[PDB]
Design a protein around this ligand. Sequence first.
Ligand SMILES: [Mg+2]
Ligand SMILES: [Mg+2]
Ligand SMILES: [Mg+2]
Ligand SMILES: [Mg+2]
Ligand SMILES: [Mg+2]
Ligand SMILES: [Mg+2]
Ligand SMILES: [Mg+2]
Ligand SMILES: [Mg+2]
Ligand SMILES: [Mg+2]
Ligand SMILES: [Mg+2]
Lengths: 216, 109
Amino acid sequence: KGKPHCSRNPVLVRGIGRYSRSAMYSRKALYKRKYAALATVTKPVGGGTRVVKLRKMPRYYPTEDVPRKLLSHGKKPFSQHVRKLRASITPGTILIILTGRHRGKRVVFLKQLSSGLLLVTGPLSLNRVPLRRTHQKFVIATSTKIDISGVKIPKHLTDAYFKKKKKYEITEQRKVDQKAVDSQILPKIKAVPQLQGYLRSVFALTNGVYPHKLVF
Amino acid sequence: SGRLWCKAIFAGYKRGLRNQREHTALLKIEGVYARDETEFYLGKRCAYVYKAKNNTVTPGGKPNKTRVIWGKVTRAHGNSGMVRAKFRSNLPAKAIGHRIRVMLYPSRI
RNA sequence: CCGGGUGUUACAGCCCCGCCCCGGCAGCAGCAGCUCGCCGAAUCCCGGGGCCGAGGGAGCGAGACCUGUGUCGCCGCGCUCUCCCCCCU
RNA sequence: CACGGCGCGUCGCGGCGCGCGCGAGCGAGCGCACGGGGUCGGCGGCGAUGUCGGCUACCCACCCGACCCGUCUUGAAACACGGACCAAGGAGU
RNA sequence: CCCAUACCCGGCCGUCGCUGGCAGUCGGCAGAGCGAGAAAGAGAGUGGCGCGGACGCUACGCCGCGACGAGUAGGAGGGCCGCUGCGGUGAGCCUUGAAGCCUAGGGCGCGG
RNA sequence: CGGGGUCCGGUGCGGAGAGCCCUUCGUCCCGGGAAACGGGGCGCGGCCGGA
Ligand SMILES: [Mg+2]
Ligand SMILES: [Mg+2]
Ligand SMILES: [Mg+2]
Ligand SMILES: [Mg+2]
Ligand SMILES: [Mg+2]
Ligand SMILES: [Mg+2]
Ligand SMILES: [Mg+2]
Ligand SMILES: [Mg+2]
Ligand SMILES: [Mg+2]
Ligand SMILES: [Mg+2]
């Protein structure tokens, strides 16, 4: 019993607390918190009753087996890895896809997903790309942004939604979600002059220009 | 539609004067000629692309005559923008002074 | 405007020297991001690139009233077995 | 502030130090991790007569390296000597 | 700024040292330890349900830590390297094909 | 028309190679800006231009 209180010290730096041992002994008020000192089931049968033993022994042991592994601590499954995002990437930023089938297409970025992939879309009405996922490494984040803080995207879309199944047919749910997102995205980009044509165009490298020199 | 990589020339292997180490290549990336300009290309993937005689399978397409040796940029070399690269297999010596595409998708911007 | 000469503050300035609270005020090995140093128990934070991941039965608690489990030792922490208050969903 | 009980407190210098008892040296759970050497409870493609894999080994190309062995000798690639090539025999019993 | 077989970190092979560790596989007849700064007893005593638990150990074996590795003349050790014959042994192989010889085939061993 | 004179402009080369040109998602409607002289044509027949 007892409601779980939050930690009494803000994290000063990772692994170091703001308050020392005595300050903690005071804040926790420990000066007044002193304390001092299955495998069988009976069943009826039509005889009598039988004590059936669940978890019965195997009917085959292999010729030989591998031993156990030593224990390690710092290794966690991909589900609960901490997700990182580049500073230059914020909702409403223009990205340049570098490796997909949509090579060098300028695309608006909306949301960071749960597994770290970026939920991205440039309204397919003009640059022909749907709601999609893209790894944050394989995109160039240019320094041009629109304001999409006042748009709502459905909460039902997620990595489970975008996960591949199994010919691929687009679903009516996909169509309606794309329409719902673009109906709010498009007027925002149409406010900025010469932005729809910019998104329609495709990025490329000509001779005499070098990425380390040019800024974006 | 356009070109999404940068030109480099496979100048030669990392070497002394009488010894050469074929597990590391030297690339001259076009347009960069100093150390304070090569930090952009560190860690970028590079590809040596060449044609052959037999057809080979390709990702997302029908088989063709093209083959690729992949690699990555490891560190700067010298003071004049030369770059050290490491490939999954040591490049053939016939590629000296030929084109290697350094791409951008291992991006940090 | 220039050249030559005289000279001692004039229609420019320079150097030294008693004091005026070492006169006073910043500031200070200065992001006036190069005017000249040695450092850090008087030092910490964040980030990027490259190579590698060898080893494989570490035990925990259960108590002769039980026989489970495979997140374990050292180390650093947080919460509860006290009671209140504040804020956001 | 790696301070935290009550006492008998001289176990004591004037309280702090610092001793003797307090069922007598047994409070428990959960959780996070810069903690006695990596894991994913993360994914993507291409596959039947043209494609996948085969270090080495067959042939060829390229860059770097690279003088013919045995022997005597201070010193051998030597303008020092033995040696066209191959098979069998051949010398501390 | 460039690089040696030098130095630092890591993997692997071997040698040497610790004259290191393991007979404790002590199981419903049992209780799973002897890594823990401090020479020595998880000391013995007498009075006030479910029947269950991986591998091991050719001890000439297995396992763990460190350091090191040039070599002529020469010395020593190990060869499950090789050739021929003899005593044993393989209820061995073989005319449903031995020996020998050839091979752009598949492999093992640092090497023989 | 070319070569000289004066004069006027630039001169760390803005008539700059630290530069210039072309710039490619495509198609469909209507409007504005430029053009009506323009665009495209082994679609054309000639005339010059070159050692
Ligand atoms: Mg040579
Ligand atoms: Mg001789
Ligand atoms: Mg001699
Ligand atoms: Mg002679
Ligand atoms: Mg002679
Ligand atoms: Mg002769
Ligand atoms: Mg012979
Ligand atoms: Mg070492
Ligand atoms: Mg030796
Ligand atoms: Mg042959």
